[PDB]
Amino acid sequence: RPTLPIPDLLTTDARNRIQLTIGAGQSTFGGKTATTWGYNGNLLGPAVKLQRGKAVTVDIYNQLTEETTLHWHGLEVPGEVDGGPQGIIPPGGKRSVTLNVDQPAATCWFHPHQHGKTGRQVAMGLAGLVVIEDDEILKLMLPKQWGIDDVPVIVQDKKFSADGQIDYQLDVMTAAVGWFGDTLLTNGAIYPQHAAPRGWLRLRLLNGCNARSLNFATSDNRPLYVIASDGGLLPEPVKVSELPVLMGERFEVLVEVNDNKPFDLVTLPVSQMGMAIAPFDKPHPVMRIQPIAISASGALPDTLSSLPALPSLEGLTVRKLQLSMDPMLDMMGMQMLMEKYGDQAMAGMDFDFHHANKINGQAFDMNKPMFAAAKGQYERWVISGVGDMMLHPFHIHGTQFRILSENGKPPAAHRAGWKDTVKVEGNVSEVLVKFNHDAPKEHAYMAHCHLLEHEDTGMMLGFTV
Ligand SMILES: [Cu+2]
Ligand SMILES: [Cu+2]
Structure with a gap:
């Protein structure tokens, strides 16, 4: 298997700025080349790392030949920097947004939000991550070695033409049931492998599919400990044998790497129009996990966070x-x-x-x-x-x-x-x-x-x- 690609962790420079370039390139899927889009790359994007209480300015360079926008999905920010369909970045143009992060630690994400073309633009390859950190989460001693025991897992499906190009269409069928494919990608790769230290592995799962719901599990039925949802830490871990994830949702889970036997992260068949067509009529590998004997010290805490109570409904x-x-x-x-x-x-x-x-x-x-x-x-x-x-x-x-x-x-x-x-x-x-x-x-x-x-x-x- 190819090794699982790891999105670069991208932090502010000396002037509190971050650069993102939106651009067309080439990727290879099953040995056949496809035109793809990415942020600072050919496909997908970096993991923009943010701290609660600290401002950053993002400089966005649209190097596509078409208009796009940049939406920070999950971020509690004013509309002005939200990157909805009104946040046009013209082809060849530059736009700067200031993000003043004021929310709990979480794994959010970013993607285009171009009017009537969001599906295509995401399908073409445009998606990145947002890693928000705060005072509180660093105190937990969760696995935190980026790309070793703290790994992003952006799971997407694509449909490819005979000539290898991404095969996207907004037509009557996909308008009804959504765009879906027969190929599963995990950080852009087909069934990759990740080498995970013995102990605890943290996966930051993102369902980056246009229309496909997913349901994560392991091949040998070992449990997943859910520690976080879209907007951050749960109060305490929830131990599950499977984890349904809707389009655009994030969950963070820990998995115990308690022996040396390789196992797969899988997605289980869902009940949703179109989505149980082969090969998604059976459990489908997402990525292979290979235990390795290198240093790790991440742990699963008893207690993660305290959240406010639900407001009174009255x-x-x-x-x-x-x-x-x-x-x-x-x-x-x-x-x-x-x-x-x-x-x-x-x-x-x-x-x-x-x-x-x-x-x-x-x-x-x-x-x-x-x-x-x-x-x-x-x-x-x-x-x-x-x-x-x-x-x-x-x-x-x-x-x-x-x-x-x-x-x-x-x-x-x-x-x-x-x-x-x-x-x-x-x-x-x-x-x-x-x-x-x-x-x-x-x-x-x-x-x-x-x-x-x-x-x-x-x-x-x-x-x-
Ligand atoms: Cu959003
Ligand atoms: Cu809908």
Whole structure:
């Protein structure tokens, strides 16, 4: 196996600046070359490291021949630096943003948010990481050797043309069910291996797929200790045998490397339209873990953090957000899916498409924020997928929120801490959300489905603070 590539840990320079160059290059998948995009590279990006309470200025150089934006998914920052569809960086141009980090330690990420082209731009290779650190987390003695026992794991699927190029399309099928492929990448590589010291291994898992949900496990069924979610440390570790991860969600887990036998991190088949088509109809290797006898001292603490209590529900503003899809889109999309793949496309399951996906009866309008949310006050947002059968990992910019109910039930323990994404699929979810920073109509916050093709075809709204 190839060794697992490790995104460079990128810190501020002497003048508190960081440089990111967005550019086209070449990558190789199964010996066949593909044009790919990356941040400071051919593909994917670095891990930008940030400290709570410390400002940094990021200089962003768009070296593509098309417009793009740069969104910091998970970051509690004003709209002005949030990099939504309004944050155009012109081809060949430079834009600088100041990030004043004021949130708990977490693994966040960044990616484009170009109007109607987010799916393509992510599919082409653009994604990076954000490692936020604070006073508190460094006291825990968690594994911390970057790329040795503290390893990022960005898992993505791609579809390739016969000639080896990435095969991306926003068409009627993918507008309905999302863009998905038959090849799995782990930090850009096909089934790589990582050499992990005996003791404890920390994986910072990111589901960077456009539309594919994942469910992580190990090949020999050893447990995963979930220590962190989108927005940071849980109160204490949650021990699981498997870990579902929605598009754009991050979890950090520890895995015990307690002997010398190699094992795989795998993803288990999911029940989501399109996603159980072979070879994802069976458990699928993500990466091979090879135990090695080199120095490590990371540990699993009993107690990780203390989070605030859920706010009292009494008197909070409630906002309804009804997710919907044009029924003509669902029919045609599911029709083209069967025409392409056949029966397996429905395993586990019991006309201008460009504006067919909606929230509150409206496809995204960049010039029309849907509402003004309060600043510094909890609100209760109620997001409903009643009426359609698709999966909608619902993401809200400018915040880390608490899940009160997820798609019918109180959240699983490992999902009860800080989240920026909530599952919506045929039912209704509730979040307790607070915005610590402002966003004017000219640089509004987004709230949207993170199934990228849904977002690109209207399942997004803007809101101010
Ligand atoms: Cu985001
Ligand atoms: Cu959706």
